[PDB]
Design an enzyme around this catalytic site. Structure first.
Site, PDB file in Angstrom:
ATOM      1  N   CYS A 166      -5.201 133.204  -7.656  1.00 37.53           N
ATOM      2  CA  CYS A 166      -4.841 132.762  -9.172  1.00 37.53           C
ATOM      3  C   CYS A 166      -6.060 132.634 -10.048  1.00 37.53           C
ATOM      4  CB  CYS A 166      -4.022 131.580  -8.903  1.00 37.53           C
ATOM      5  SG  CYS A 166      -3.564 130.844 -10.709  1.00 37.53           S
ATOM      6  N   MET A 172      -7.451 128.352  -5.136  1.00 37.45           N
ATOM      7  CA  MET A 172      -6.044 128.796  -5.212  1.00 37.45           C
ATOM      8  C   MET A 172      -5.820 130.217  -4.753  1.00 37.45           C
ATOM      9  SD  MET A 172      -2.620 128.063  -7.850  1.00 37.45           S
ATOM     10  CE  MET A 172      -1.123 128.754  -7.270  1.00 37.45           C
ATOM     11  N   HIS A 229      -6.802 129.313 -11.265  1.00 29.64           N
ATOM     12  CA  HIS A 229      -7.452 127.983 -10.330  1.00 29.64           C
ATOM     13  C   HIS A 229      -8.335 128.646  -9.339  1.00 29.64           C
ATOM     14  CE1 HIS A 229      -3.984 126.161 -12.633  1.00 29.64           C
ATOM     15  NE2 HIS A 229      -5.043 125.177 -12.662  1.00 29.64           N
ATOM     16  N   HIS A 273       0.332 130.111 -13.625  1.00 32.02           N
ATOM     17  CA  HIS A 273      -0.562 130.648 -12.554  1.00 32.02           C
ATOM     18  C   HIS A 273      -0.337 132.194 -12.633  1.00 32.02           C
ATOM     19  CE1 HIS A 273      -0.629 126.760 -10.255  1.00 32.02           C
ATOM     20  NE2 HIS A 273       0.745 126.685 -10.634  1.00 32.02           N
TER      21      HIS A 273
HETATM   22 CU   LIG Z   1      -2.829 128.960 -10.079  1.00 31.49          CU
END
Ligand SMILES: [Cu+2]
Length: 105
Positions: free
Chosen positions: A89, A97, A92, A39
């Site tokens: 992130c 996210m 994602h 991440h």
């Molecule tokens: Cu992430």
């Protein structure tokens, strides 16, 4: 006060937990890898106070965090203005996210 934000739900869902944190000057937010790394933490420059690229870049941890429980923290000193700070992130972002820090004062 220190607020811990998990990166990745226990089930593997691509979420920050808690996604919304309210802080006061001097408080710290600490992101910690939980599930399914990597991440990272990127602040949206149009979604921080003053739409400041400098401020968004200062808060971001653009380097991917691969290690189990790897952590990144921000202490919100006086050079962090009041307002909301939205972050995401990059791996994602599509999946949603995303998170928000509200700095009170
Ligand atoms: Cu992430």
């Amino acid at each position: 006060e220190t607020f811990t934000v998990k990166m990745g739900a226990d089930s593997g869902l691509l979420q920050f937990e808690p996604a919304n944190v309210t802080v006061h000057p001097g408080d710290t937010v600490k992101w910690v890898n939980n599930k399914l790394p990597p991440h990272n933490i990127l602040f949206a420059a149009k979604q921080v106070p003053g739409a400041s690229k400098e401020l968004a870049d200062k808060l971001s941890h653009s380097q991917l965090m691969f290690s189990p429980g790897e952590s990144y923290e921000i202490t919100f000193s006086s050079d962090f203005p009041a307002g909301t700070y939205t972050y995401y992130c990059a791996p994602h972002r599509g999946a949603g996210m995303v998170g928000k820090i509200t700095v009170e004062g």
